[model samples]
Target: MEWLVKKSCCNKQDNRHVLMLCDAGGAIKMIAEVKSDFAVKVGDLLSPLQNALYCINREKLHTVKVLSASSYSPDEWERQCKVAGKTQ
Candidate 1:
């Protein structure tokens, strides 16, 4: 599994929220408002959430909350085209 952060205009200005992209099992998962105790920097990994309930296994670091998470459908191409108001 690989974790990636989204590069977008809205995400550039937000310090309290983050847009995380998880790539696993041939599926793409998008999570928004992943709150962190500290300011979430760019290129943050979403690995810790896989085993632990919090952001880091160490002390002091707070838990990360997934405000919203959605997995791309098998017909993601159709969805993306529809979202873009285009035809494939």
Candidate 2:
């Protein structure tokens, strides 16, 4: 349930951060922790869409969008949220 890279959640985060992964529709799917130099953005194709909807509960941040879906061409190409600091 994980990929090497892909994402951008509508969160209060910045560059080189422990960021979350939202689908093209704004759904928070995964939370990834990267190094100080690692970073991400939209269309990265990681994580799920459900988690993005739970950030604020109902009418989630990922509500009403079409970037990470069919439009973006990511057919459930999902990854994992809770990124592990240590290798699994």
Candidate 3:
């Protein structure tokens, strides 16, 4: 599960504490929401995107390609949690 890490720029910080990041290459972008106990911070070296599906509730990793989506809500998350995956 090696993800291609790159330097990303924080584009937008949403009201929900979600940060929109764009890869340095400008080939991909992702929104990461701040959750309780989450570790990432502004300007930190982060893996902005991944191809693995993760079950946040179960705290387990689901190795699969769940096509990239804009965002997923709690209900949608229950249906499927995403992790490392192809970027749009």
**Model 2 CA lDDT for position 29:** 52
Counting clashing residue pairs in each candidate, in order, gives: 0, 11, 6
The list of candidate 1 runs beyond 4 A from truth reads 8-16, 24-29, 50-63, 72-88
Model 2: residues with Cα > 4 Å off, grouped in runs: 1-16, 22-28, 36-39, 46-88
- C-alpha displacement of 17 in model 1, angstroms? 1.1
Assess the local accuracy of residue 20 in candidate 3 as a C-alpha lDDT between 0 and 100: 36
Model 3 spans > 4 angstroms off: 1-16, 24-27, 34-39, 48-88
Return whichever of 1 and 3 wins on TM-score.
1
- What digit string (tens of lDDT, one per residue) describes model 1 on residues 1-88? 4455542112223333434355533246564445455544445555555542335223336455554445544354234323323232
Q: Candidate 3, residue 59: CA error in Å?
A: 18
Give the C-alpha miss distance for residue 36 in model 3, angstroms: 4.2
lDDT by candidate, in order shown = 0.43, 0.33, 0.31
Deviation of model 3 at 3, angstroms: 9.2
- lDDT tens digits, residues 2-49, model 3? 221122122122212233334544356454433322323344333323
Q: Which candidate is the best by lDDT?
A: 1
Model 2 lDDT at residue 68:
24
lDDT of 2 by residue, 1-80 (tens): 32222344332232223334444556435444333222244444343344322121222242222122222323332231
